[PDB]
């Protein structure tokens, strides 16, 4: 009846930072009952709100072993490939997702809004025709974690 894993916290490290900086998350979870399989964690960058086609899976890791207990790991993943991001979605708000999957089933989804912005007043007001990602600051809106759990089969 009870979910064998619950995620307790996520801390967003090294934020704000350049767009090119790796995403770095401290993730804390409790296992109330020994797992026989690995936990699969993903960081997914939403390249474009309009379409899921533009998702970038920044990394996918298998975490284990998972005996009952309180666990933490730091999940780091390289920044997205700007060559796949639509110019119009580059500057402004998007989302990054952290996801966990057990035996092929996603049981949790943590979302953060991400504001990508120039910091130079010249650029902010007169932004480049094509985005300059070397000059964009990524600000993950860490004070507002959005958390969604899903009922899965833990057997």
């Amino acid at each position: 009846a009870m979910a064998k894993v619950q995620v307790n916290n996520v801390v967003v490290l090294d934020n704000p930072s350049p767009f090119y900086n790796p995403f770095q998350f401290e993730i804390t979870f409790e296992c109330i009952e020994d797992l026989s399989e690995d936990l699969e964690w993903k960081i997914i960058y939403v390249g474009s709100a309009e379409s899921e086609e533009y998702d970038q899976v920044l990394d996918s890791v298998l975490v284990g072993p998972v005996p009952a207990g309180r666990h933490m790991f730091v999940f780091q993943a390289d920044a997205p490939n700007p060559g796949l991001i639509p110019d119009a979605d580059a500057v402004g708000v998007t989302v990054v997702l952290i996801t966990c999957t057990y035996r092929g089933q996603e049981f949790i989804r943590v979302g953060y809004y991400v504001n990508n912005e120039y910091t130079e007043t010249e650029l902010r007001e007169n932004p480049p025709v094509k985005p300059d990602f070397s000059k964009l600051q990524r600000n993950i809106l860490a004070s507002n974690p959005r958390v969604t759990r899903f009922h899965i089969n833990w057997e």
Partner: peptide, 28 residues
């Protein structure tokens, strides 16, 4: 009078809730 999401905000809210879940503020 409750406000409304723009198409982009609404698109991002749907990604955040995944397969039709209830999105909460934080972890507990």
């Amino acid at each position: 009078a409750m406000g409304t999401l723009t198409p982009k905000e609404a698109e991002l809210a749907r990604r955040i809730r995944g397969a039709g879940g209830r999105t909460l503020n934080g972890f507990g």
